[PDB]
Design an enzyme around this catalytic site. Structure first.
Site, PDB file in Angstrom:
ATOM      1  N   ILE A  18       8.601  -0.438   3.217  1.00  0.00           N
ATOM      2  CA  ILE A  18       7.366  -0.709   2.503  1.00  0.00           C
ATOM      3  C   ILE A  18       6.263  -1.176   3.458  1.00  0.00           C
ATOM      4  O   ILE A  18       6.531  -1.862   4.457  1.00  0.00           O
ATOM      5  CB  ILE A  18       7.597  -1.741   1.383  1.00  0.00           C
ATOM      6  CG1 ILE A  18       6.270  -2.194   0.769  1.00  0.00           C
ATOM      7  CG2 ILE A  18       8.387  -2.928   1.911  1.00  0.00           C
ATOM      8  CD1 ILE A  18       6.436  -3.054  -0.473  1.00  0.00           C
ATOM      9  N   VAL A  19       5.027  -0.789   3.162  1.00  0.00           N
ATOM     10  CA  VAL A  19       3.893  -1.151   4.001  1.00  0.00           C
ATOM     11  C   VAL A  19       2.905  -1.995   3.213  1.00  0.00           C
ATOM     12  O   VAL A  19       2.513  -1.623   2.102  1.00  0.00           O
ATOM     13  CB  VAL A  19       3.166   0.099   4.521  1.00  0.00           C
ATOM     14  CG1 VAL A  19       1.965  -0.298   5.380  1.00  0.00           C
ATOM     15  CG2 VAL A  19       4.132   0.989   5.301  1.00  0.00           C
ATOM     16  N   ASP A  44       6.509  13.473  13.473  1.00  0.00           N
ATOM     17  CA  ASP A  44       6.059  13.628  12.097  1.00  0.00           C
ATOM     18  C   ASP A  44       4.548  13.757  12.091  1.00  0.00           C
ATOM     19  O   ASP A  44       3.839  12.991  11.418  1.00  0.00           O
ATOM     20  CB  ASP A  44       6.470  12.418  11.261  1.00  0.00           C
ATOM     21  CG  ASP A  44       6.223  12.628   9.782  1.00  0.00           C
ATOM     22  OD1 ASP A  44       6.227  13.801   9.344  1.00  0.00           O
ATOM     23  OD2 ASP A  44       6.032  11.619   9.063  1.00  0.00           O
ATOM     24  N   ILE A  74       0.807  -1.216   0.000  1.00  0.00           N
ATOM     25  CA  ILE A  74       0.000   0.000   0.000  1.00  0.00           C
ATOM     26  C   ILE A  74       0.847   1.275   0.000  1.00  0.00           C
ATOM     27  O   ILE A  74       0.367   2.337  -0.388  1.00  0.00           O
ATOM     28  CB  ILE A  74      -1.034   0.035   1.155  1.00  0.00           C
ATOM     29  CG1 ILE A  74      -0.338   0.032   2.516  1.00  0.00           C
ATOM     30  CG2 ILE A  74      -2.020  -1.133   1.039  1.00  0.00           C
ATOM     31  CD1 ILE A  74      -1.278   0.338   3.668  1.00  0.00           C
ATOM     32  N   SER A  75       2.104   1.165   0.418  1.00  0.00           N
ATOM     33  CA  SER A  75       2.982   2.331   0.483  1.00  0.00           C
ATOM     34  C   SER A  75       4.443   1.895   0.410  1.00  0.00           C
ATOM     35  O   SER A  75       4.814   0.855   0.964  1.00  0.00           O
ATOM     36  CB  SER A  75       2.714   3.134   1.764  1.00  0.00           C
ATOM     37  OG  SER A  75       3.403   4.374   1.765  1.00  0.00           O
ATOM     38  N   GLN A  76       5.267   2.682  -0.280  1.00  0.00           N
ATOM     39  CA  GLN A  76       6.666   2.319  -0.518  1.00  0.00           C
ATOM     40  C   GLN A  76       7.594   3.532  -0.469  1.00  0.00           C
ATOM     41  O   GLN A  76       7.135   4.675  -0.461  1.00  0.00           O
ATOM     42  CB  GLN A  76       6.813   1.599  -1.863  1.00  0.00           C
TER      43      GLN A  76
END
Ligand SMILES: Nc1ncnc2c1ncn2[C@@H]1O[C@H](COP(=O)(O)OP(=O)(O)NP(=O)(O)O)[C@@H](O)[C@H]1O
Lengths: 177, 236
Positions: free
Chosen positions: B22-23, B140, B18-20
């Site tokens: 990496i998730v 963050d 889903i995201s890189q």
């Protein structure tokens, strides 16, 4: 009795059984050298989630870090604990001379199926007590929250509304080894 | 990459990136027997090997703090850089996207003056106040790192992504966290961005004001530093 596998370790099976009205804990402990099982004190185990999380940590540790103890069975008793001290884990998480319930745990590393009939025979030859289903309904009967709080060093300010809430804190401690 | 992860997990564990680092999401629990878990999916975060260790430790510490809402830490393999987490949030109706605060705000941006919006944003501020009151910093704090969990017709803000988090009693770090979020909210250029930040601040302040005289003094300190950070945040 239940036979399970951890997804990333398909060739390692673990059998878990729960006994109540146990009569010969003292005898089991004295022969624990002669017998391979781990005999775990259910007062410190509040859920399947907790137990399986320790089984996961055990396999991760042995595969990717270092085994500290004799075998997988004893390594899992260590991994259930919040401590690095092996003797203290064995003492606190292992059955006691006065245990009236116990969890009987065994890793089966060989490929090939667990001989369940033989396993049930061996366990009943060792344990003088009444097997009941290994599930959360039965585990919720025997855990001791006060003892758990002491052993896992949980603050009085932590006030989980249910077993899931408590279990979550124990899994955290387990995973952070 | 996807190769090493799938090999590590074996074909028994489904994954969808889903995201890189990496998730991924997966429907497979890392250790409960199949059908004995109780959630449709989970998150796997992979970071080739100290954010993995840092995030795990902080998630555990924060969970113990009453009122604080963070994803469950399910499994940690520090040797290979994997952590498995509870999946929080869902897809907003009408294709408005994943229910992080950014997408929620965008979705309501044409008509934000509602009990839902203000109440939700105050709850966001309360999470940050609890974090700071307890001397933690996020590191963050963007509108993407605040995830809304549906609770009937309400939303329950959770904080995620603590890779850069820390223990800290320094008002400087607390001020910077707030400033990072303030600027992220403003960066959409929405006419209502100032109002959103004001609602967030209301929830933040309520947390400190619940702490009697000591809370009021600690609040003044943080709000003073935060104004200084705003000043030092812009060209002079
Ligand atoms: N617990 C979760 N539930 C749903 N989505 C999440 C969850 N955790 C993270 N994701 C997402 O992961 C993202 C990126 O995380 P990432 O910045 O790599 O972690 P980091 O070490 O904290 N920094 C997102 O923007 C997500 O929405």
């Amino acid at each position: 009795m239940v036979v399970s596998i951890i997804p990333q370790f398909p060739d390692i099976k673990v059998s878990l059984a729960l006994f109540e009205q146990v009569k010969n804990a003292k005898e089991i402990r004295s022969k624990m050298s002669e017998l391979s099982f781990a005999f775990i004190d259910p007062r410190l185990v509040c859920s399947g989630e907790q137990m399986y999380s320790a089984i996961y940590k055990t396999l991760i540790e042995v595969k990717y870090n270092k085994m500290r103890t004799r075998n997988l069975n004893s390594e899992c008793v260590l991994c259930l604990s919040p401590t690095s001290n092996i003797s203290d884990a064995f003492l606190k998480f292992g059955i006691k001379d006065d245990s009236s319930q116990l969890i009987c745990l065994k890793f089966h590393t060989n490929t090939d199926d667990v001989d369940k009939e033989q396993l049930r025979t061996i366990m009943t030859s060792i344990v003088k007590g009444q097997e009941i289903e290994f599930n959360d309904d039965n585990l919720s009967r025997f855990y001791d929250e006060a003892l758990i709080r002491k052993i896992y060093k949980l603050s009085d300010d932590f006030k989980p509304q249910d077993v899931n809430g408590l279990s979550r804190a124990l899994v955290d401690a387990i995973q952070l080894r | 990459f996807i190769d090493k992860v799938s090999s590590y997990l074996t074909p028994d564990v489904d994954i969808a990136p889903i995201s890189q680092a990496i998730v991924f999401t997966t429907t497979t629990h890392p250790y409960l027997p199949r059908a004995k878990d109780s959630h449709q999916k989970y998150i796997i975060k992979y970071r080739p090997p100290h954010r993995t260790l840092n995030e795990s430790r902080l998630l555990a510490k924060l969970y113990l703090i009453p009122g604080l809402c963070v994803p469950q830490l399910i499994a940690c393999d520090p040797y290979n850089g994997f952590i498995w987490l509870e999946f929080l949030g869902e897809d907003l109706p009408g294709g408005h996207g994943f229910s992080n605060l950014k997408n929620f705000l965008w979705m309501h941006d044409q008509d934000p003056y509602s009990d839902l919006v203000a109440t939700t944003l105050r709850k966001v501020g309360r999470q940050i106040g609890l974090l700071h009151w307890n001397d933690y910093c996020h590191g963050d704090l963007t509108s993407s790192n605040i995830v809304l969990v549906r609770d009937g017709a309400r939303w329950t803000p959770h904080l995620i992504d603590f890779g850069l988090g820390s223990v800290s009693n320094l008002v400087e770090d607390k001020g910077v966290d707030l400033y990072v979020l303030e600027r992220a909210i403003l960066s959409t250029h929405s006419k209502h961005a100032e109002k959103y930040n004001a609602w967030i601040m209301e929830g933040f302040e309520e947390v400190y004001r619940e702490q009697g005289a000591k809370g009021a003094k600690k609040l003044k300190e943080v709000t003073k530093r935060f104004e200084e950070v705003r000043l030092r945040g812009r060209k002079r």
